[PDB]
Amino acid sequence: PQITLWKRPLVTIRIGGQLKEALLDTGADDTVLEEMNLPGKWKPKMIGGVGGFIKVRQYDQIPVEICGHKVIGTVLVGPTPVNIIGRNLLTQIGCTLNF
Amino acid sequence: PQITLWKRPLVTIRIGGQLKEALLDTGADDTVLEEMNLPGKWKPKMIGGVGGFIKVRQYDQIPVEICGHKVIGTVLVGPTPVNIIGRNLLTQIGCTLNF
Ligand SMILES: COC(=O)N[C@H](C(=O)N[C@@H](Cc1ccccc1)[C@@H](O)CN(Cc1ccc(-c2ccccn2)cc1)NC(=O)[C@@H](NC(=O)OC)C(C)(C)C)C(C)(C)C
């Protein structure tokens, strides 16, 4: 698809049994999801945005379905205002900015 | 051009004679520049990112040059860690997210 930017670029994603809305974010290095109890090992990290830092849990090698595209990578979980799909997963779906 | 997302989509912008590096950010409603002086009236605004809110100064109808494209719109100035080009100006350059 070709997504214009008059509205927030929100899509539905699937992570295990859970459907969520998430923002396609070219200004995010990383994918950050709202609080959820994913399986397996995690590492505590801090990530920075506008307004300062938040503490997140880093889970590696997590399958996520984004608009029917299957990706597998790193997901951070923490007190983000919105679910954010960052470049680490945008690159796995083949996303580019065009103008 | 087409910009891949392997690295941060940083581009050079020109504003009022000044060169700046800025991030093309589909996850930003607004364009927000690091602290700088601009002419004309402004008013305070609070904008929220992942780590909370910052207070910025809102300037309307500011011309910006982004990758050869002349745009005019609202620019927020304040304590952002990075210059951000948000959807208000991305729409003016006709940017789409493609995958
Ligand atoms: C290298 O660090 C990052 O990549 N940081 C990312 C990040 O914060 N990205 C910012 C751009 C950025 C990059 C580097 C340093 C600082 C900031 C944005 O891509 C995503 N972010 C994601 C975001 C989106 C919505 C909201 C929000 C806020 C209030 C109410 C509803 N939503 C908060 C954060 N958007 C905003 O913060 C924007 N906020 C905004 O559009 O609010 C409507 C601003 C910018 C206009 C302030 C994450 C923490 C998401 C990984």
PDB file of C-alpha atoms and ligand atoms in Angstrom:
ATOM      1  CA  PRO A   1       0.000   0.000   0.000  1.00  0.00           C
ATOM      2  CA  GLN A   2       0.848   3.710  -0.204  1.00  0.00           C
ATOM      3  CA  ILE A   3      -0.104   5.511   2.985  1.00  0.00           C
ATOM      4  CA  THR A   4      -0.640   9.253   2.923  1.00  0.00           C
ATOM      5  CA  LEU A   5       0.038  11.303   6.014  1.00  0.00           C
ATOM      6  CA  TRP A   6      -3.061  13.482   6.445  1.00  0.00           C
ATOM      7  CA  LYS A   7      -4.025  11.204   9.342  1.00  0.00           C
ATOM      8  CA  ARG A   8      -1.913   9.292  11.798  1.00  0.00           C
ATOM      9  CA  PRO A   9      -0.619   6.174  10.018  1.00  0.00           C
ATOM     10  CA  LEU A  10      -2.324   3.654  12.314  1.00  0.00           C
ATOM     11  CA  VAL A  11      -2.572  -0.036  11.454  1.00  0.00           C
ATOM     12  CA  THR A  12      -3.760  -3.145  13.270  1.00  0.00           C
ATOM     13  CA  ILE A  13      -1.065  -5.564  14.437  1.00  0.00           C
ATOM     14  CA  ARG A  14      -1.271  -9.039  15.913  1.00  0.00           C
ATOM     15  CA  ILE A  15       1.064 -10.303  18.614  1.00  0.00           C
ATOM     16  CA  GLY A  16       0.034 -13.784  19.700  1.00  0.00           C
ATOM     17  CA  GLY A  17      -3.627 -13.797  20.588  1.00  0.00           C
ATOM     18  CA  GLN A  18      -3.743  -9.998  20.827  1.00  0.00           C
ATOM     19  CA  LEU A  19      -4.936  -7.474  18.236  1.00  0.00           C
ATOM     20  CA  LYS A  20      -3.694  -3.910  18.791  1.00  0.00           C
ATOM     21  CA  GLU A  21      -3.588  -0.580  17.015  1.00  0.00           C
ATOM     22  CA  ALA A  22      -0.108   0.785  16.342  1.00  0.00           C
ATOM     23  CA  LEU A  23       1.542   3.779  14.707  1.00  0.00           C
ATOM     24  CA  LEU A  24       3.965   3.364  11.763  1.00  0.00           C
ATOM     25  CA  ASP A  25       6.832   5.593  12.950  1.00  0.00           C
ATOM     26  CA  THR A  26       9.811   6.451  10.805  1.00  0.00           C
ATOM     27  CA  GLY A  27      11.160   8.585  13.714  1.00  0.00           C
ATOM     28  CA  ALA A  28      11.397   5.575  16.039  1.00  0.00           C
ATOM     29  CA  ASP A  29      14.535   3.439  16.066  1.00  0.00           C
ATOM     30  CA  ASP A  30      12.655   0.755  17.992  1.00  0.00           C
ATOM     31  CA  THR A  31       9.208  -0.809  18.320  1.00  0.00           C
ATOM     32  CA  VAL A  32       7.542   0.046  21.636  1.00  0.00           C
ATOM     33  CA  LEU A  33       4.324  -1.562  22.837  1.00  0.00           C
ATOM     34  CA  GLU A  34       2.034  -0.858  25.768  1.00  0.00           C
ATOM     35  CA  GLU A  35       2.317  -3.118  28.831  1.00  0.00           C
ATOM     36  CA  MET A  36       1.964  -6.842  28.081  1.00  0.00           C
ATOM     37  CA  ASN A  37       3.332 -10.128  29.467  1.00  0.00           C
ATOM     38  CA  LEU A  38       5.265 -11.715  26.585  1.00  0.00           C
ATOM     39  CA  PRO A  39       6.963 -15.134  26.941  1.00  0.00           C
ATOM     40  CA  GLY A  40      10.682 -15.656  27.472  1.00  0.00           C
ATOM     41  CA  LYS A  41      13.753 -13.763  28.592  1.00  0.00           C
ATOM     42  CA  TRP A  42      13.822  -9.969  28.682  1.00  0.00           C
ATOM     43  CA  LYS A  43      16.346  -7.256  29.569  1.00  0.00           C
ATOM     44  CA  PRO A  44      15.532  -3.910  31.212  1.00  0.00           C
ATOM     45  CA  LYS A  45      16.385  -0.935  29.005  1.00  0.00           C
ATOM     46  CA  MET A  46      15.866   2.814  28.954  1.00  0.00           C
ATOM     47  CA  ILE A  47      14.784   4.596  25.784  1.00  0.00           C
ATOM     48  CA  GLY A  48      14.419   8.299  25.138  1.00  0.00           C
ATOM     49  CA  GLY A  49      11.798  10.321  23.356  1.00  0.00           C
ATOM     50  CA  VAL A  50      10.431  13.817  23.526  1.00  0.00           C
ATOM     51  CA  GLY A  51       9.780  14.565  27.168  1.00  0.00           C
ATOM     52  CA  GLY A  52      12.502  12.282  28.503  1.00  0.00           C
ATOM     53  CA  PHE A  53      13.158   8.610  29.136  1.00  0.00           C
ATOM     54  CA  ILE A  54      11.074   5.574  29.912  1.00  0.00           C
ATOM     55  CA  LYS A  55      12.035   2.187  31.235  1.00  0.00           C
ATOM     56  CA  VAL A  56      11.047  -0.738  29.048  1.00  0.00           C
ATOM     57  CA  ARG A  57      11.408  -4.510  28.874  1.00  0.00           C
ATOM     58  CA  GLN A  58      13.301  -5.712  25.792  1.00  0.00           C
ATOM     59  CA  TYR A  59      12.088  -8.986  24.261  1.00  0.00           C
ATOM     60  CA  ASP A  60      13.986 -10.405  21.310  1.00  0.00           C
ATOM     61  CA  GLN A  61      12.844 -12.591  18.425  1.00  0.00           C
ATOM     62  CA  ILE A  62       9.106 -11.907  18.842  1.00  0.00           C
ATOM     63  CA  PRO A  63       6.739 -12.657  15.924  1.00  0.00           C
ATOM     64  CA  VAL A  64       4.408  -9.772  15.030  1.00  0.00           C
ATOM     65  CA  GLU A  65       1.875  -9.663  12.161  1.00  0.00           C
ATOM     66  CA  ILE A  66       1.622  -6.168  10.645  1.00  0.00           C
ATOM     67  CA  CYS A  67      -1.077  -5.796   7.996  1.00  0.00           C
ATOM     68  CA  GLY A  68      -0.704  -9.489   7.108  1.00  0.00           C
ATOM     69  CA  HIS A  69       3.125  -9.255   6.951  1.00  0.00           C
ATOM     70  CA  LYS A  70       4.946 -11.555   9.347  1.00  0.00           C
ATOM     71  CA  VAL A  71       7.999  -9.999  11.019  1.00  0.00           C
ATOM     72  CA  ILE A  72      10.202 -11.388  13.818  1.00  0.00           C
ATOM     73  CA  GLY A  73      12.278  -9.059  15.931  1.00  0.00           C
ATOM     74  CA  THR A  74      12.812  -6.942  18.978  1.00  0.00           C
ATOM     75  CA  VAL A  75       9.840  -5.486  20.835  1.00  0.00           C
ATOM     76  CA  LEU A  76      10.135  -3.121  23.757  1.00  0.00           C
ATOM     77  CA  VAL A  77       7.260  -3.079  26.235  1.00  0.00           C
ATOM     78  CA  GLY A  78       6.574  -0.203  28.606  1.00  0.00           C
ATOM     79  CA  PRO A  79       4.568   2.922  29.387  1.00  0.00           C
ATOM     80  CA  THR A  80       4.361   4.282  25.894  1.00  0.00           C
ATOM     81  CA  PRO A  81       1.398   6.536  25.088  1.00  0.00           C
ATOM     82  CA  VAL A  82       0.699   4.586  21.872  1.00  0.00           C
ATOM     83  CA  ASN A  83       1.907   1.348  20.309  1.00  0.00           C
ATOM     84  CA  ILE A  84       4.776   2.273  17.959  1.00  0.00           C
ATOM     85  CA  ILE A  85       6.178   0.259  15.068  1.00  0.00           C
ATOM     86  CA  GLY A  86       9.702   1.531  14.592  1.00  0.00           C
ATOM     87  CA  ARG A  87      12.346   1.071  11.938  1.00  0.00           C
ATOM     88  CA  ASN A  88      13.560  -2.285  13.179  1.00  0.00           C
ATOM     89  CA  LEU A  89      10.230  -3.803  12.047  1.00  0.00           C
ATOM     90  CA  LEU A  90       9.398  -1.294   9.256  1.00  0.00           C
ATOM     91  CA  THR A  91      12.526  -2.519   7.455  1.00  0.00           C
ATOM     92  CA  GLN A  92      11.269  -6.119   7.736  1.00  0.00           C
ATOM     93  CA  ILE A  93       8.028  -5.198   5.937  1.00  0.00           C
ATOM     94  CA  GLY A  94       9.966  -3.322   3.209  1.00  0.00           C
ATOM     95  CA  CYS A  95       8.712   0.138   4.133  1.00  0.00           C
ATOM     96  CA  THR A  96      10.156   3.303   2.514  1.00  0.00           C
ATOM     97  CA  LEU A  97       9.397   7.032   2.545  1.00  0.00           C
ATOM     98  CA  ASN A  98       8.628   8.401  -0.916  1.00  0.00           C
ATOM     99  CA  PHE A  99       8.255  11.963  -2.213  1.00  0.00           C
TER     100      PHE A  99
ATOM    101  CA  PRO B   1      13.386  10.436  -3.786  1.00  0.00           C
ATOM    102  CA  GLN B   2      12.826   7.105  -2.034  1.00  0.00           C
ATOM    103  CA  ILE B   3      14.287   6.885   1.471  1.00  0.00           C
ATOM    104  CA  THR B   4      14.880   3.485   3.041  1.00  0.00           C
ATOM    105  CA  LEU B   5      14.676   3.088   6.801  1.00  0.00           C
ATOM    106  CA  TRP B   6      17.813   1.108   7.561  1.00  0.00           C
ATOM    107  CA  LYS B   7      19.130   4.257   9.181  1.00  0.00           C
ATOM    108  CA  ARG B   8      17.383   7.311  10.655  1.00  0.00           C
ATOM    109  CA  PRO B   9      15.741   9.300   7.812  1.00  0.00           C
ATOM    110  CA  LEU B  10      17.742  12.447   8.484  1.00  0.00           C
ATOM    111  CA  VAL B  11      17.735  15.206   5.886  1.00  0.00           C
ATOM    112  CA  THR B  12      18.992  18.754   5.692  1.00  0.00           C
ATOM    113  CA  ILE B  13      16.488  21.547   5.984  1.00  0.00           C
ATOM    114  CA  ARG B  14      16.919  25.273   5.593  1.00  0.00           C
ATOM    115  CA  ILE B  15      15.065  27.769   7.735  1.00  0.00           C
ATOM    116  CA  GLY B  16      15.721  31.519   7.729  1.00  0.00           C
ATOM    117  CA  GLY B  17      19.295  31.138   6.438  1.00  0.00           C
ATOM    118  CA  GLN B  18      20.190  28.288   8.798  1.00  0.00           C
ATOM    119  CA  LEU B  19      21.109  24.717   7.888  1.00  0.00           C
ATOM    120  CA  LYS B  20      19.705  22.008  10.162  1.00  0.00           C
ATOM    121  CA  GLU B  21      19.561  18.231  10.158  1.00  0.00           C
ATOM    122  CA  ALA B  22      16.016  16.924  10.745  1.00  0.00           C
ATOM    123  CA  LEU B  23      14.248  13.605  11.088  1.00  0.00           C
ATOM    124  CA  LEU B  24      11.361  12.760   8.736  1.00  0.00           C
ATOM    125  CA  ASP B  25       8.883  11.446  11.273  1.00  0.00           C
ATOM    126  CA  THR B  26       5.583   9.844  10.321  1.00  0.00           C
ATOM    127  CA  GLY B  27       4.919   9.364  14.084  1.00  0.00           C
ATOM    128  CA  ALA B  28       4.898  13.134  14.718  1.00  0.00           C
ATOM    129  CA  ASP B  29       1.757  15.214  14.319  1.00  0.00           C
ATOM    130  CA  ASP B  30       3.819  18.391  14.512  1.00  0.00           C
ATOM    131  CA  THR B  31       7.177  19.739  13.354  1.00  0.00           C
ATOM    132  CA  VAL B  32       9.448  20.526  16.310  1.00  0.00           C
ATOM    133  CA  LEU B  33      12.860  22.170  16.094  1.00  0.00           C
ATOM    134  CA  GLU B  34      15.550  22.392  18.767  1.00  0.00           C
ATOM    135  CA  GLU B  35      15.883  25.727  20.548  1.00  0.00           C
ATOM    136  CA  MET B  36      16.566  28.594  18.190  1.00  0.00           C
ATOM    137  CA  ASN B  37      15.397  32.139  17.556  1.00  0.00           C
ATOM    138  CA  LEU B  38      12.674  32.871  15.010  1.00  0.00           C
ATOM    139  CA  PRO B  39      10.979  36.177  14.197  1.00  0.00           C
ATOM    140  CA  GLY B  40       7.352  37.027  14.847  1.00  0.00           C
ATOM    141  CA  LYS B  41       4.621  36.196  17.285  1.00  0.00           C
ATOM    142  CA  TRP B  42       4.508  32.891  19.077  1.00  0.00           C
ATOM    143  CA  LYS B  43       2.486  31.260  21.742  1.00  0.00           C
ATOM    144  CA  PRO B  44       3.270  28.558  24.248  1.00  0.00           C
ATOM    145  CA  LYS B  45       2.030  25.008  23.717  1.00  0.00           C
ATOM    146  CA  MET B  46       2.584  21.712  25.503  1.00  0.00           C
ATOM    147  CA  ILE B  47       3.372  18.691  23.306  1.00  0.00           C
ATOM    148  CA  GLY B  48       3.725  15.124  24.456  1.00  0.00           C
ATOM    149  CA  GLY B  49       6.164  12.433  23.535  1.00  0.00           C
ATOM    150  CA  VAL B  50       7.018   9.050  24.910  1.00  0.00           C
ATOM    151  CA  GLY B  51       8.627  10.452  28.076  1.00  0.00           C
ATOM    152  CA  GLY B  52       6.103  13.191  28.825  1.00  0.00           C
ATOM    153  CA  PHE B  53       5.381  16.764  27.820  1.00  0.00           C
ATOM    154  CA  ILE B  54       7.597  19.639  26.859  1.00  0.00           C
ATOM    155  CA  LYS B  55       6.696  23.292  26.562  1.00  0.00           C
ATOM    156  CA  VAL B  56       7.394  24.762  23.144  1.00  0.00           C
ATOM    157  CA  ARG B  57       6.799  28.009  21.269  1.00  0.00           C
ATOM    158  CA  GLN B  58       4.413  27.774  18.341  1.00  0.00           C
ATOM    159  CA  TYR B  59       5.231  29.880  15.266  1.00  0.00           C
ATOM    160  CA  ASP B  60       2.749  29.937  12.385  1.00  0.00           C
ATOM    161  CA  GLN B  61       3.417  30.302   8.666  1.00  0.00           C
ATOM    162  CA  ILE B  62       7.136  29.723   8.684  1.00  0.00           C
ATOM    163  CA  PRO B  63       8.813  28.899   5.352  1.00  0.00           C
ATOM    164  CA  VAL B  64      11.087  25.840   5.373  1.00  0.00           C
ATOM    165  CA  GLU B  65      13.065  24.200   2.592  1.00  0.00           C
ATOM    166  CA  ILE B  66      13.139  20.384   2.779  1.00  0.00           C
ATOM    167  CA  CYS B  67      15.083  18.450   0.107  1.00  0.00           C
ATOM    168  CA  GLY B  68      14.474  21.107  -2.532  1.00  0.00           C
ATOM    169  CA  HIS B  69      10.799  21.492  -1.605  1.00  0.00           C
ATOM    170  CA  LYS B  70       9.613  24.855  -0.295  1.00  0.00           C
ATOM    171  CA  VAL B  71       6.886  24.486   2.333  1.00  0.00           C
ATOM    172  CA  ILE B  72       5.126  26.910   4.723  1.00  0.00           C
ATOM    173  CA  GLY B  73       3.587  25.915   8.012  1.00  0.00           C
ATOM    174  CA  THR B  74       3.547  25.753  11.772  1.00  0.00           C
ATOM    175  CA  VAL B  75       6.903  25.142  13.460  1.00  0.00           C
ATOM    176  CA  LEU B  76       7.258  24.408  17.161  1.00  0.00           C
ATOM    177  CA  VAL B  77      10.507  25.355  18.917  1.00  0.00           C
ATOM    178  CA  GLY B  78      11.632  23.836  22.182  1.00  0.00           C
ATOM    179  CA  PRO B  79      13.618  21.210  24.084  1.00  0.00           C
ATOM    180  CA  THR B  80      13.387  18.371  21.615  1.00  0.00           C
ATOM    181  CA  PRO B  81      16.475  16.115  21.438  1.00  0.00           C
ATOM    182  CA  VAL B  82      16.308  16.195  17.628  1.00  0.00           C
ATOM    183  CA  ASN B  83      14.818  18.373  14.924  1.00  0.00           C
ATOM    184  CA  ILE B  84      11.634  16.630  13.749  1.00  0.00           C
ATOM    185  CA  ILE B  85       9.686  17.141  10.516  1.00  0.00           C
ATOM    186  CA  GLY B  86       6.138  15.997  11.278  1.00  0.00           C
ATOM    187  CA  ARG B  87       3.084  15.203   9.224  1.00  0.00           C
ATOM    188  CA  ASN B  88       2.030  18.811   8.785  1.00  0.00           C
ATOM    189  CA  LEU B  89       5.038  19.390   6.521  1.00  0.00           C
ATOM    190  CA  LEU B  90       5.387  15.831   5.204  1.00  0.00           C
ATOM    191  CA  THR B  91       1.968  16.226   3.631  1.00  0.00           C
ATOM    192  CA  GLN B  92       3.124  19.413   1.905  1.00  0.00           C
ATOM    193  CA  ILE B  93       6.068  17.654   0.252  1.00  0.00           C
ATOM    194  CA  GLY B  94       3.689  14.824  -0.791  1.00  0.00           C
ATOM    195  CA  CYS B  95       5.385  12.141   1.276  1.00  0.00           C
ATOM    196  CA  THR B  96       3.893   8.643   1.481  1.00  0.00           C
ATOM    197  CA  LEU B  97       4.852   5.523   3.422  1.00  0.00           C
ATOM    198  CA  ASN B  98       5.129   2.673   0.912  1.00  0.00           C
ATOM    199  CA  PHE B  99       5.334  -1.074   1.452  1.00  0.00           C
TER     200      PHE B  99
HETATM  201  C1  LIG C   1      16.339   7.303  19.186  1.00  0.00           C
HETATM  202  O1  LIG C   1      15.197   7.507  20.023  1.00  0.00           O
HETATM  203  C2  LIG C   1      13.919   7.153  19.445  1.00  0.00           C
HETATM  204  O2  LIG C   1      13.887   6.604  18.321  1.00  0.00           O
HETATM  205  N1  LIG C   1      12.857   7.427  20.205  1.00  0.00           N
HETATM  206  C3  LIG C   1      11.528   7.111  19.732  1.00  0.00           C
HETATM  207  C4  LIG C   1      10.795   8.429  19.716  1.00  0.00           C
HETATM  208  O3  LIG C   1      10.481   8.928  20.787  1.00  0.00           O
HETATM  209  N2  LIG C   1      10.525   8.974  18.531  1.00  0.00           N
HETATM  210  C5  LIG C   1       9.852  10.277  18.313  1.00  0.00           C
HETATM  211  C6  LIG C   1      10.898  11.121  17.583  1.00  0.00           C
HETATM  212  C7  LIG C   1      12.144  11.259  18.430  1.00  0.00           C
HETATM  213  C8  LIG C   1      13.315  10.654  18.015  1.00  0.00           C
HETATM  214  C9  LIG C   1      14.476  10.762  18.779  1.00  0.00           C
HETATM  215  C10 LIG C   1      14.427  11.476  19.971  1.00  0.00           C
HETATM  216  C11 LIG C   1      13.254  12.097  20.383  1.00  0.00           C
HETATM  217  C12 LIG C   1      12.107  11.990  19.605  1.00  0.00           C
HETATM  218  C13 LIG C   1       8.636  10.195  17.385  1.00  0.00           C
HETATM  219  O4  LIG C   1       8.911   9.563  16.121  1.00  0.00           O
HETATM  220  C14 LIG C   1       7.497   9.355  17.863  1.00  0.00           C
HETATM  221  N3  LIG C   1       6.708   9.997  18.901  1.00  0.00           N
HETATM  222  C15 LIG C   1       5.656   8.986  19.161  1.00  0.00           C
HETATM  223  C16 LIG C   1       4.465   9.505  19.929  1.00  0.00           C
HETATM  224  C17 LIG C   1       3.239   9.662  19.297  1.00  0.00           C
HETATM  225  C18 LIG C   1       2.144  10.146  20.004  1.00  0.00           C
HETATM  226  C19 LIG C   1       2.236  10.485  21.356  1.00  0.00           C
HETATM  227  C20 LIG C   1       1.027  11.026  22.075  1.00  0.00           C
HETATM  228  C21 LIG C   1       1.149  12.071  22.987  1.00  0.00           C
HETATM  229  C22 LIG C   1       0.024  12.574  23.633  1.00  0.00           C
HETATM  230  C23 LIG C   1      -1.224  12.032  23.339  1.00  0.00           C
HETATM  231  C24 LIG C   1      -1.314  10.999  22.410  1.00  0.00           C
HETATM  232  N4  LIG C   1      -0.209  10.528  21.804  1.00  0.00           N
HETATM  233  C25 LIG C   1       3.463  10.325  21.987  1.00  0.00           C
HETATM  234  C26 LIG C   1       4.566   9.839  21.288  1.00  0.00           C
HETATM  235  N5  LIG C   1       6.156  11.164  18.511  1.00  0.00           N
HETATM  236  C27 LIG C   1       6.244  12.262  19.293  1.00  0.00           C
HETATM  237  O5  LIG C   1       6.861  12.304  20.361  1.00  0.00           O
HETATM  238  C28 LIG C   1       5.459  13.445  18.758  1.00  0.00           C
HETATM  239  N6  LIG C   1       4.212  13.489  19.522  1.00  0.00           N
HETATM  240  C29 LIG C   1       3.051  13.446  18.898  1.00  0.00           C
HETATM  241  O6  LIG C   1       2.872  13.367  17.677  1.00  0.00           O
HETATM  242  O7  LIG C   1       1.921  13.465  19.779  1.00  0.00           O
HETATM  243  C30 LIG C   1       0.608  13.453  19.198  1.00  0.00           C
HETATM  244  C31 LIG C   1       6.153  14.786  18.807  1.00  0.00           C
HETATM  245  C32 LIG C   1       7.535  14.618  18.160  1.00  0.00           C
HETATM  246  C33 LIG C   1       5.342  15.800  17.981  1.00  0.00           C
HETATM  247  C34 LIG C   1       6.346  15.302  20.235  1.00  0.00           C
HETATM  248  C35 LIG C   1      10.876   6.004  20.567  1.00  0.00           C
HETATM  249  C36 LIG C   1      10.969   6.217  22.089  1.00  0.00           C
HETATM  250  C37 LIG C   1       9.418   5.842  20.110  1.00  0.00           C
HETATM  251  C38 LIG C   1      11.578   4.695  20.224  1.00  0.00           C
END
